[PDB]
């Protein structure tokens, strides 16, 4: 019995950035790593970034270095993802997916959110 | 709380009534026995209290 | 990166039929690290297959799936009503963490 | 310091260890740099996730204090009732405490096992081709490079393979 | 694995040992078998069957329930009465889950103990005779027969007979 | 003999340790005698100073017992009563025996790790230079006088001082 | 305070068998080994055999192989003999004996069972 | 919150003995050694000798080394000293002093009695 809520839909402007959020229950504390997955309509899952459980230790992928920023709370157990400097085509679906274990690596996604539309 | 029994008197089982309360989220006060009803009687009995 | 390249794409079937899901990799995959995902539109993917040969909890029986090197496939003996969305396969012994084309199953 | 391992002859932590608990440090010609021991990590994760939901489930049933009213004339009665909710509030409260205090005792003692116990992994692998410098650290008597370090990380070092130039170096 | 003997460097059991806890296996010219360490699995049932008794003791003096009745007009009382019981019944519940969750971990963990501690009674007995292979067993650096792995095994290792005829087969 | 030192390896006590919980014992051409280790033993005396305060604490708060009179048709109240009072009474006394029996065996445990982690700390600091007896005992390969036992009782042992003439003296 | 209870006295006749049992209390589960020892009236007591605690190995006398089963559940704690092809000489005591320790080797009887008469 | 409680002044004379007491509170067992100062008016402090904690081991200054007995009783946390032989210049103001540790050597006096006042 573990769900993710995210936050709702959005609408915004080239140029402007967004604020996705993803609170995580189940237990007083995220032990189990997060990482960010979308999906542009006519186009397949792309992984974004994801951030370990308790360290807070960030990675991203080559595409979109610079241009995401993936931050955690401890206290709230909730995980940002911040996309800054949006152009065309970022339209897209984002989920986040919980990992099997604490750490990005060598792991796989047990859960996903049910998902935030953002149009630009 | 200031405003209790205006006429000076008791009540029986005061307490176990709060107590019933303590389980009841909703009274529909329903007329039982109308004050026109008491016909033989005077029924505008009132005091200074 | 790897590039996963699912070949079927669009496989139409009628409850009963066999469903078999082929995914490719460009490169072996390390420790044979690929999943596999139910996709139904406007619903959270689950997660069916890990590893590409242990069950993911609450599936049932008819998941299951095998394959190693950069060969994997998904096969599922029965289809139910409920069988028909896209299946996606990523690989999780990478870093980029590459992600299937998705195959959508139609009703015949 | 149950074990003797944290704050004990591996007296300091390490800042740069930012990905894992517990894990090594290596140091040869091509460089050097952290790497944290991933399982042994998931592993004390396991434990502190079940350790915690166990704490919940326990105290989900503690008792509930209720209001109630009492006459001037039942103050036995009334005694009875604060007395009651008194006595079991204090009983809760204790356990509670306690629980957290005994936790807290096993958790850095677990802790402080898994390093000996990974400490001692290292060393019962690379049993005479190091040195055991008695601060956490082994220096090899052959040259071991990232892919012979990298086998020390994953337990699969092949002792029979450095057996022979070990011993030559470890002799004169 | 707290001390690291079960599932540590010892990753797995022995279905052979059918006469205890623990024991030694040994292998030379004459033949191998098991043999089952009588003294440590003795001492095990000790504290397992004392741990047993204590937990029936401690509990045998618990809150037990009385049925009552209570008018209509005493709905303080008969509910005062029902959080009496039912609280009582939530503290021995609560002692009796957490006893044996706690005694599971220890008897586990007791069990690891010994093991380490019968692989180190080796050890620093056969300090420098044998070759530690690092998977809980010995390989001895001279001819070990029956009568010498007989003397391993109830603690009465004669090193200094073994202390010639080793060294000259460990330096070549 | 959870950590195999207290009644393992080291079969005896000293009746001529007067000062200190643990200690050392040294004899060489100058003389012998025992000394304590004072900083151990001090870190010993925290932990059951403060294990104890902890006890007194948690039981301050304890149920208390007051005396009331109840007339003879309050037998259900005057039974209520007196299975209260009992009650928490056996709750109380099951907590004050268990953490008792609980807390003796930590610190006959914590005693035993002392042991343990002074016997491994003597040995990863005289590495090789010594022969590991087995018996709780370290024999020098090299002259180690008042001053150099003084070193090893306080952790500043010179290995590289005494590295090359130790070597001599074990291969031949 | 350690008692073992056992059958009543049975009657049999030449090639049928005999089913003695012995209940040890003290305890949640048996810790110590239970032998049986018997006495022909006119002779000695002789070992038959015993079986150890919780493993269940069982030792039997170089006399009495092929004859005797000594059996337990450890669910009740109870021990059983089977003595089979019952022939002449097999009338004595039965008596169930309880170890000093979990194994048979190297251990005494501290009790004895009150025992049981069989006759042929 | 440690207090340390001593006897009352006390009057003697050449040839007897003063047996003064020092008892501490703030547990149930002594954990600190405790050793004895005294200060005879017009003269500075003087160390006198002092007792372990636990294992009552106890050590005096030379200079009154066959004079002075302190003893301590484990079951109720209390300090004597036993000054004998009185002579002259006797008088002073004796305090007991705890120590920061269990043993004399390497520690610091935390807390000092009130004092006792001992004429001859
Ligand atoms: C351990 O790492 C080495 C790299 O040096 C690799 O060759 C080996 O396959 C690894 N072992 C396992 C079990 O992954
Ligand atoms: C240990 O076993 C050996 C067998 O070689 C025997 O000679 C010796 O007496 C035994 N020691 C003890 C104490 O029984
Ligand atoms: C340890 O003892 C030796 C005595 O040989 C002394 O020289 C050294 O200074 C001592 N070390 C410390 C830190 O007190």
Chains 1, 7, 8 share one sequence.
Not at chain 1, 91 to 106: E, F, L, Q
Not at chain 2, 4 to 27: A, I, M, Q, T, W
Not at chain 4, 76 to 92: I, P, S, T
Request: aromatic share 12%; hydrophobic share 30%.
């Amino acid at each position: 019995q573990v769900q993710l809520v995210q936050s709702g839909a959005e609408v915004k402007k080239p140029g402007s950035s967004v604020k996705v959020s993803c609170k995580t229950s189940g237990g007083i504390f995220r032990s189990n790593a997060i990482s960010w997955v979308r999906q542009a309509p006519g186009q397949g899952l792309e992984w974004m970034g994801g951030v370990v459980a308790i360290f807070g230790t960030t990675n991203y992928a080559q595409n979109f270095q610079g241009r995401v920023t993936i931050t955690a709370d401890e206290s709230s157990s909730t995980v940002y993802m911040e996309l800054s400097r949006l152009r065309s085509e970022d339209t897209a679906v984002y989920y986040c997916a919980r990992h099997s274990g604490y750490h990005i690596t060598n792991t796989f996604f047990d859960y996903w959110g049910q998902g935030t539309l953002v149009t630009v | 709380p200031r405003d209790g029994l205006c006429y000076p008197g008791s009540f029986n089982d005061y307490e176990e009534l709060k107590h019933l309360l303590s389980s009841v989220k909703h009274f529909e006060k329903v007329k039982i026995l109308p004050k026109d009803r008491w016909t033989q009687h005077t029924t505008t009995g009132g005091s200074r209290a | 990166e790897i590039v996963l390249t699912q070949s079927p794409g669009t496989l139409s079937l009628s409850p009963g039929d066999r469903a078999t899901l082929s995914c490719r990799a460009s490169q072996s995959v390390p420790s044979s690290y690929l999943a596999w995902y139910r996709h139904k539109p406007g619903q959270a993917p689950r997660l069916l297959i890990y590893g590409a040969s242990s069950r993911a909890t609450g599936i049932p029986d008819r998941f299951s799936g095998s394959g190693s090197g950069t060969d994997f496939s998904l096969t599922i003996s029965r289809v139910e009503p409920e069988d028909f969305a896209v299946y996606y396969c990523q690989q999780y012994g990478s870093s980029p963490y590459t992600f299937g084309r998705g195959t959508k199953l139609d009703i015949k | 310091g149950l074990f003797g391992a944290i704050a004990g002859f591996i007296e300091g932590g390490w800042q740069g260890m930012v990905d894992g608990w517990y894990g090594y440090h290596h140091s040869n010609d091509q460089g050097s740099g952290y790497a944290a021991d991933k399982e042994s990590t998931q592993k004390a994760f396991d434990c502190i996730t079940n350790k915690v939901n166990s704490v919940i489930e326990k105290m989900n049933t503690q008792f509930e204090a209720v209001g109630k009213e009492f006459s001037n004339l039942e103050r036995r009665l009334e005694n009875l009732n604060k007395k009651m909710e008194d006595g079991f509030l204090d009983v809760w409260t204790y356990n509670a405490e306690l629980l957290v205090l005994m936790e807290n005792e096993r958790t850095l003692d677990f802790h402080d096992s898994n390093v000996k116990n990974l400490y001692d992994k290292v060393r019962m692998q690379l049993r005479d081709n190091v040195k055991e410098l008695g601060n956490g650290c082994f220096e090899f008597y052959h040259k071991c490079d990232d892919e012979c370090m990298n086998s020390v990380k994953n337990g699969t070092y092949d002792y029979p393979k450095y057996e022979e130039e070990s011993k030559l170096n470890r002799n004169e």
